[PDB]
Amino acid sequence: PMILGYWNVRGLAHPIRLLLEYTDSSYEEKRYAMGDAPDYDRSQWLNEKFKLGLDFPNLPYLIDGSRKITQSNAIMRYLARKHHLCGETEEERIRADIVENQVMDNRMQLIMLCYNPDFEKQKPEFLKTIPEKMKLYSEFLGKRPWFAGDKVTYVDFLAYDILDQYHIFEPKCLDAFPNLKDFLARFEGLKKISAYMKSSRYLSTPIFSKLAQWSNK
Amino acid sequence: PMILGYWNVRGLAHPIRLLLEYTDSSYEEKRYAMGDAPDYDRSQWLNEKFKLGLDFPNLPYLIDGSRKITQSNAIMRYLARKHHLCGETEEERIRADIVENQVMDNRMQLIMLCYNPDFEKQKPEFLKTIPEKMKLYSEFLGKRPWFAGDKVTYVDFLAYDILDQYHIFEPKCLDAFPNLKDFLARFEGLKKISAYMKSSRYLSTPIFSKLAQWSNK
Ligand SMILES: N[C@@H](CCC(=O)N[C@@H](CS[C@@H]1c2ccccc2-c2ccccc2[C@H]1O)C(=O)NCC(=O)O)C(=O)O
Numbered sequence: 162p163m164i165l166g167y168w169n170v171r172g173l174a175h176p177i178r179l180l181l182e183y184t185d186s187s188y189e190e191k192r193y194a195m196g197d198a199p200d201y202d203r204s205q206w207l208n209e210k211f212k213l214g215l216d217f218p219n220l221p222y223l224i225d226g227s228r229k230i231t232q233s234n235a236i237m238r239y240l241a242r243k244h245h246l247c248g249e250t251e252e253e254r255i256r257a258d259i260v261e262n263q264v265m266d267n268r269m270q271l272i273m274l275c276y277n278p279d280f281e282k283q284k285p286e287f288l289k290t291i292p293e294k295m296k297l298y299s300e301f302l303g304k305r306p307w308f309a310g311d312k313v314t315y316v317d318f319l320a321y322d323i324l325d326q327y328h329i330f331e332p333k334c335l336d337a338f339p340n341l342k343d344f345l346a347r348f349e350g351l352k353k354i355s356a357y358m359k360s361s362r363y364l365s366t367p368i369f370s371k372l373a374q375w376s377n378k
Numbered sequence: 379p380m381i382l383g384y385w386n387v388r389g390l391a392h393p394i395r396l397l398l399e400y401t402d403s404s405y406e407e408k409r410y411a412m413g414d415a416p417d418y419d420r421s422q423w424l425n426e427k428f429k430l431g432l433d434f435p436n437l438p439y440l441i442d443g444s445r446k447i448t449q450s451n452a453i454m455r456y457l458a459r460k461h462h463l464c465g466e467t468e469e470e471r472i473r474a475d476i477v478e479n480q481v482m483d484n485r486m487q488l489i490m491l492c493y494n495p496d497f498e499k500q501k502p503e504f505l506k507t508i509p510e511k512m513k514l515y516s517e518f519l520g521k522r523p524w525f526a527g528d529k530v531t532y533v534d535f536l537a538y539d540i541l542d543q544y545h546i547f548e549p550k551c552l553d554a555f556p557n558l559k560d561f562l563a564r565f566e567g568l569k570k571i572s573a574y575m576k577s578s579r580y581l582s583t584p585i586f587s588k589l590a591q592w593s594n595k
């Protein structure tokens with residue numbers, strides 16, 4: 162099978178795990194565990210980091226036969242090409258490229274807030290920036306079913322993840338944006354996704370490691 | 379012509395400026411200035427941030443007729459598709475996708491250090507990690523002339539920028555890796571690039587904004 166390797170956290174592997182299920186991929190995962198405070202041992206990973214034949218060793222990785230890939234975006238693109246879930250026109254490619262990169266910015270922002278010792282102090286200020294973030298997603302989507310246009314593409318897996326994560330952080334953030342709420346329901350309603358979400362493989366939380374100040378357990 | 383918008387620094391706009399040059403693109407640039415400490419005024423950008431019709435307002439931005447793009451990687455990709463500077467085979471595409479994202483990782487590592495108020499005391503620990511970073515680029519390129527294979531692609535633009543930045547930071551960091559020294563020379567050897575480096579438009583330094591601890595002026 163293909164092998165997906167990542168920590169036993171949702172983290173940034175969610176979109177890949179969802180895409181693996183959506184495409185009926187034949188895969189197995191190696192979910193590495195971090196030890197506890199104080200050392201947060203990373204040895205299960207460290208002992209084989211340089212022994213997998215990865216060009217730039219990292220997590221997540223995907224082994225697919227002869228192919229070995231690192232960089233979550235690269236894995237997502239690889240699967241997208243494999244299963245034809247890319248933009249098909251120039252307009253669709255642009256929207257996808259924008260979305261991919263924007264999701265990563267919004268991801269980092271959350272991460273940066275959550276790994277900050279002054280979380281509680283920072284939070285209030287961060288919560289006020291949300292509406293403006295959501296409004297940009299909402300206006301970009303507009304009336305389309307999917308972020309790139311008429312067809313589900315790998316970018317919808319990314320958008321779903323970040324919008325979902327945002328919603329968990331601030332449950333009311335999507336109230337003024339019904340098209341985003343509708344997107345989340347349309348995405349979760351895809352058949353394989355629905356099945357996966359009820360399964361033993363599903364890992365919706367924790368989002369971060371033990372180091373974080375939120376969703377770290 | 380196309381309009382490229384960014385700060386009046388090299389920052390992450392270097393690969394785009396180089397690619398617009400290498401492609402003989404017709405373009406005009408808007409280089410927004412930031413004020414000095416302690417306020418670091420961003421008003422020149424903020425005055426128009428929400429007036430350019432961008433989906434997700436940011437710097438850099440590319441305006442190409444009716445096409446408005448934000449996200450530096452997206453801008454690179456757009457320009458690459460227009461000029462046929464993408465991988466042509468799956469193997470080139472995979473190599474390109476990894477490098478793109480890897481470059482961003484190594485860029486962010488430099489920023490985390492350069493923006494840390496504790497820069498001077500952090501520096502030694504960072505330096506220690508350089509050789510490993512370079513080694514992985516070195517081994518990845520191996521004997522190829524370019525990062526994706528036998529022809530230049532947009533990812534050489536990003537690779538050039540990051541290797542050059544690290545070399546500026548630690549001049550001796552490429553001594554051990556002749557193939558990296560050679561790639562730099564090859565890149566700079568390109569006629570259009572060579573020509574640009576002598577032009578009035580060339581902006582090598584500062585690397586960072588005025589907020590940084592290094593290469594901020
Ligand atoms: N740009 C790359 C990034 C690869 C990378 O950094 N991997 C992390 C795990 S990922 C972690 C994370 C854990 C939970 C939630 C979010 C993140 C996250 C998000 C954005 C950026 C970096 C992170 C990270 O905080 C790691 O453990 N690396 C193995 C190693 O260094 O030996 C990608 O897109 O794949």
Ligand SMILES: N[C@@H](CCC(=O)N[C@@H](CS[C@@H]1c2ccccc2-c2ccccc2[C@H]1O)C(=O)NCC(=O)O)C(=O)O
Nearest residue numbers: 262266389390436437438449450451485489585586587
């Ligand atoms: N992921 C996006 C990143 C867009 C973005 O953050 N842009 C910054 C300037 S870019 C700056 C930088 C200046 C010098 C050197 C490096 C960077 C950099 C590198 C990686 C990530 C972020 C940065 C940044 O620290 C900016 O001023 N934004 C306008 C605003 O917020 O109103 C991209 O790839 O395009």
